Design an enzyme around this catalytic site. Structure first.
Site, PDB file in Angstrom:
ATOM      1  N   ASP A 185       9.171  -2.360  10.147  1.00 27.52           N
ATOM      2  CA  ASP A 185       8.282  -2.634   9.020  1.00 27.52           C
ATOM      3  C   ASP A 185       8.692  -1.723   7.871  1.00 27.52           C
ATOM      4  OD1 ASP A 185       6.100  -3.787   7.663  1.00 27.52           O
ATOM      5  OD2 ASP A 185       4.698  -2.485   8.777  1.00 27.52           O
ATOM      6  N   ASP A 204       4.480   4.843   9.738  1.00 32.50           N
ATOM      7  CA  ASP A 204       4.097   3.494  10.248  1.00 32.50           C
ATOM      8  C   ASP A 204       5.170   2.891  11.097  1.00 32.50           C
ATOM      9  OD1 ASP A 204       2.600   1.090  10.877  1.00 32.50           O
ATOM     10  OD2 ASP A 204       2.200   0.561   8.753  1.00 32.50           O
TER      11      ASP A 204
HETATM   12  N1  LIG Z   1       1.116  10.630   2.175  1.00 29.60           N
HETATM   13  C1  LIG Z   1       0.736  10.171   3.377  1.00 29.60           C
HETATM   14  N2  LIG Z   1      -0.052   9.132   3.492  1.00 29.60           N
HETATM   15  C2  LIG Z   1      -0.148   8.676   4.761  1.00 29.60           C
HETATM   16  C3  LIG Z   1       0.386   9.221   5.905  1.00 29.60           C
HETATM   17  N3  LIG Z   1       0.178   8.409   7.003  1.00 29.60           N
HETATM   18  C4  LIG Z   1      -0.392   7.381   6.519  1.00 29.60           C
HETATM   19  N4  LIG Z   1      -0.596   7.475   5.164  1.00 29.60           N
HETATM   20  C5  LIG Z   1      -1.251   6.505   4.188  1.00 29.60           C
HETATM   21  O1  LIG Z   1      -2.079   5.604   4.893  1.00 29.60           O
HETATM   22  C6  LIG Z   1      -1.621   4.254   4.737  1.00 29.60           C
HETATM   23  C7  LIG Z   1      -1.855   3.557   6.043  1.00 29.60           C
HETATM   24  O2  LIG Z   1      -1.003   4.201   6.998  1.00 29.60           O
HETATM   25  P1  LIG Z   1      -0.095   3.265   7.908  1.00 29.60           P
HETATM   26  O3  LIG Z   1       0.634   3.890   9.137  1.00 29.60           O
HETATM   27  O4  LIG Z   1       0.827   2.489   7.063  1.00 29.60           O
HETATM   28  O5  LIG Z   1      -1.141   2.262   8.576  1.00 29.60           O
HETATM   29  P2  LIG Z   1      -1.535   0.706   8.440  1.00 29.60           P
HETATM   30  O6  LIG Z   1      -0.306   0.048   8.060  1.00 29.60           O
HETATM   31  O7  LIG Z   1      -2.675   0.504   7.438  1.00 29.60           O
HETATM   32  N5  LIG Z   1      -2.058   0.335   9.936  1.00 29.60           N
HETATM   33  P3  LIG Z   1      -1.260  -0.485  11.088  1.00 29.60           P
HETATM   34  O8  LIG Z   1       0.242   0.160  10.949  1.00 29.60           O
HETATM   35  O9  LIG Z   1      -1.902  -0.224  12.490  1.00 29.60           O
HETATM   36  O10 LIG Z   1      -1.364  -1.899  10.730  1.00 29.60           O
HETATM   37  C8  LIG Z   1      -0.178   4.424   4.293  1.00 29.60           C
HETATM   38  O11 LIG Z   1       0.303   3.334   3.528  1.00 29.60           O
HETATM   39  C9  LIG Z   1      -0.289   5.635   3.383  1.00 29.60           C
HETATM   40  O12 LIG Z   1      -1.006   5.354   2.200  1.00 29.60           O
HETATM   41  C10 LIG Z   1       1.131  10.337   5.766  1.00 29.60           C
HETATM   42  O13 LIG Z   1       1.713  10.913   6.679  1.00 29.60           O
HETATM   43  N6  LIG Z   1       1.304  10.755   4.446  1.00 29.60           N
HETATM   44  N1  LIG Z   2       1.847  -8.936   0.060  1.00 33.30           N
HETATM   45  C1  LIG Z   2       2.806  -9.962  -0.288  1.00 33.30           C
HETATM   46  C2  LIG Z   2       4.186  -9.766   0.302  1.00 33.30           C
HETATM   47  C3  LIG Z   2       5.245 -10.655  -0.288  1.00 33.30           C
HETATM   48  C4  LIG Z   2       6.392 -10.883   0.690  1.00 33.30           C
HETATM   49  C5  LIG Z   2       6.079 -11.106   2.162  1.00 33.30           C
HETATM   50  N2  LIG Z   2       7.315 -10.989   2.945  1.00 33.30           N
HETATM   51  C6  LIG Z   2       5.072 -10.043   2.554  1.00 33.30           C
HETATM   52  O1  LIG Z   2       5.756  -8.809   2.408  1.00 33.30           O
HETATM   53  C7  LIG Z   2       5.196  -7.548   2.806  1.00 33.30           C
HETATM   54  C8  LIG Z   2       4.992  -7.519   4.318  1.00 33.30           C
HETATM   55  O2  LIG Z   2       4.044  -8.445   4.840  1.00 33.30           O
HETATM   56  C9  LIG Z   2       4.529  -6.131   4.673  1.00 33.30           C
HETATM   57  O3  LIG Z   2       4.175  -6.149   6.046  1.00 33.30           O
HETATM   58  C10 LIG Z   2       2.842  -6.363   6.353  1.00 33.30           C
HETATM   59  O4  LIG Z   2       2.936  -7.629   6.978  1.00 33.30           O
HETATM   60  C11 LIG Z   2       3.616  -7.706   8.249  1.00 33.30           C
HETATM   61  C12 LIG Z   2       3.498  -9.131   8.749  1.00 33.30           C
HETATM   62  O5  LIG Z   2       3.371 -10.052   7.665  1.00 33.30           O
HETATM   63  C13 LIG Z   2       2.960  -6.743   9.215  1.00 33.30           C
HETATM   64  O6  LIG Z   2       3.537  -6.963  10.501  1.00 33.30           O
HETATM   65  C14 LIG Z   2       3.199  -5.369   8.573  1.00 33.30           C
HETATM   66  N3  LIG Z   2       3.030  -4.300   9.556  1.00 33.30           N
HETATM   67  C15 LIG Z   2       2.321  -5.283   7.298  1.00 33.30           C
HETATM   68  O7  LIG Z   2       2.242  -3.985   6.657  1.00 33.30           O
HETATM   69  C16 LIG Z   2       5.647  -5.157   4.442  1.00 33.30           C
HETATM   70  N4  LIG Z   2       5.332  -3.854   5.038  1.00 33.30           N
HETATM   71  C17 LIG Z   2       5.837  -5.121   2.937  1.00 33.30           C
HETATM   72  C18 LIG Z   2       6.208  -6.486   2.370  1.00 33.30           C
HETATM   73  N5  LIG Z   2       6.357  -6.413   0.909  1.00 33.30           N
HETATM   74  O8  LIG Z   2       3.970 -10.105   1.681  1.00 33.30           O
HETATM   75 MG   LIG Z   3       1.691  -1.009  10.404  1.00 28.89          MG
HETATM   76 MG   LIG Z   4       1.417   0.234   7.065  1.00 31.19          MG
END
Ligand SMILES: Nc1nc2c(ncn2[C@@H]2O[C@H](COP(=O)(O)OP(=O)(O)NP(=O)(O)O)[C@@H](O)[C@H]2O)c(=O)[nH]1
Ligand SMILES: NC[C@@H]1CC[C@@H](N)[C@@H](O[C@H]2[C@H](O)[C@@H](O[C@H]3O[C@H](CO)[C@@H](O)[C@H](N)[C@H]3O)[C@H](N)C[C@@H]2N)O1
Ligand SMILES: [Mg+2]
Ligand SMILES: [Mg+2]
Ligand SMILES: [Cl-]
EC number: 2.3.1.-
Length: 288
Positions: A185, A204
């Site tokens: 991701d 993440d």
């Molecule tokens: N600066 C900072 N922000 C953090 C940290 N861990 C998480 N975050 C913040 O919290 C948000 C959510 O964390 P993340 O692991 O991406 O979780 P999620 O994607 O919402 N949940 P899931 O991965 O289970 O779907 C991140 O995009 C970021 O804004 C960290 O170590 N540092």
């Molecule tokens: N928001 C509009 C954008 C436009 C492009 C499309 N490819 C997707 O792109 C995003 C994409 O979805 C994002 O992953 C999210 O979704 C995944 C499954 O869909 C999840 O498993 C993932 N863990 C979650 O965080 C990615 N991190 C960033 C990309 N820009 O949506």
């Molecule tokens: Mg995630």
């Molecule tokens: Mg995330």
């Protein structure tokens, strides 16, 4: 601050000596919330065993100066999961930030990314071998679920979008290459920069698994408002080396084509009509 209060209670309840002095929502998905606690800890929560197993595997095996979560607190049950780790300090990479960077700064960031990916993808994954993901098989199973549920009620346009995708999926060769441990991701909202715009941390690893090597380039190659752009991904691929760039692009394009269907399937699995409607609407937008 009602959410905050419940979560403050749960943290203090499950981690006995932990005292919450401050707590704020730092991010949210549709079925998770992340909290910044005492301006120092990140607590991710959900109503996370694999994710924990992955941070543990990586913190043992990676040699890198790039920081990743190090799990200090975990509670995992059927009904509730919490992971806590020290916040990695930095600024998240965005298109806007990237565009202000000098050419040399950009190049160093790309090299840092390539280097991290090369090291992770090179790890012997025997100790995490349970974490395997077969994307092609997953898609086939999601298609079967569509057929068992709402497929018959879809429009002909929607059906053709799906069948056209499945035809492409059946003909492609991009699932037949190297497998390795991927972040899976790897988008710029998970990448932290330090004060010199150098890659300082990555977060993440929740979707991480043993999967096609191409997978970690899907977002680096994405053309959208959220990501830097296709040129960024191409350059990273060239720095990374020993990988077929055209197939990496084919893989990204197929995944992009799947997105609306993935969205529909999420709505079915989680009983969320909103997502079913959104994915179907996106099929029409893409068709026209
Ligand atoms: N600066 C900072 N922000 C953090 C940290 N861990 C998480 N975050 C913040 O919290 C948000 C959510 O964390 P993340 O692991 O991406 O979780 P999620 O994607 O919402 N949940 P899931 O991965 O289970 O779907 C991140 O995009 C970021 O804004 C960290 O170590 N540092
Ligand atoms: N928001 C509009 C954008 C436009 C492009 C499309 N490819 C997707 O792109 C995003 C994409 O979805 C994002 O992953 C999210 O979704 C995944 C499954 O869909 C999840 O498993 C993932 N863990 C979650 O965080 C990615 N991190 C960033 C990309 N820009 O949506
Ligand atoms: Mg995630
Ligand atoms: Mg995330
Ligand atoms: Cl609907």
């Amino acid at each position: 601050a009602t959410n905050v209060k419940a979560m403050k209670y749960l943290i203090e309840h499950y981690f006995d000596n932990f005292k919450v002095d401050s707590i704020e929502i730092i991010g949210s998905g549709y079925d998770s919330v992340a909290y910044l606690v005492n301006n120092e800890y990140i607590f991710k929560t959900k109503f996370y065993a694999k994710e924990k197993a992955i941070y543990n595997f990586l913190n043992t095996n990676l040699e890198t100066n790039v920081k990743i979560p190090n799990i200090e607190y975990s509670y995992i049950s059927d009904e509730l999961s919490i992971l806590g780790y020290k916040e990695i300090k930095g600024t998240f990479l965005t298109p806007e930030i990237y565009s202000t960077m000098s050419e040399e700064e950009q190049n160093l960031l790309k090299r840092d990314i390539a280097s991290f990916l090369r090291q992770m993808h090179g790890l012997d994954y025997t100790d995490i071998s349970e974490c395997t993901i077969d994307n092609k098989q997953n898609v086939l199973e999601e298609y079967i679920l569509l057929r068992e549920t709402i497929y018959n009620d879809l429009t002909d346009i929607e059906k053709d979008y799906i069948e056209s995708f499945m035809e492409r999926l059946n003909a492609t060769t991009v699932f037949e290459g190297k497998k390795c441990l991927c972040h899976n991701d790897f988008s710029c909202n998970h990448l932290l920069l330090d004060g010199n715009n150098r890659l300082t941390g990555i977060i993440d690893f929740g979707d991480s698994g043993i999967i096609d090597e191409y997978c970690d380039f899907i977002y680096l190659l994405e053309d959208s408002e959220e990501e830097i752009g296709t040129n960024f991904g191409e350059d990273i691929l060239r720095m990374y080396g020993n990988i077929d760039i055209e197939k990496a692009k084919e893989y990204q394009d197929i995944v992009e084509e799947y997105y609306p269907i993935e969205t529909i399937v999420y709505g079915i699995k989680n009983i969320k009509q909103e997502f079913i409607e959104n994915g179907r609407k996106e099929i029409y937008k893409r068709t026209y």
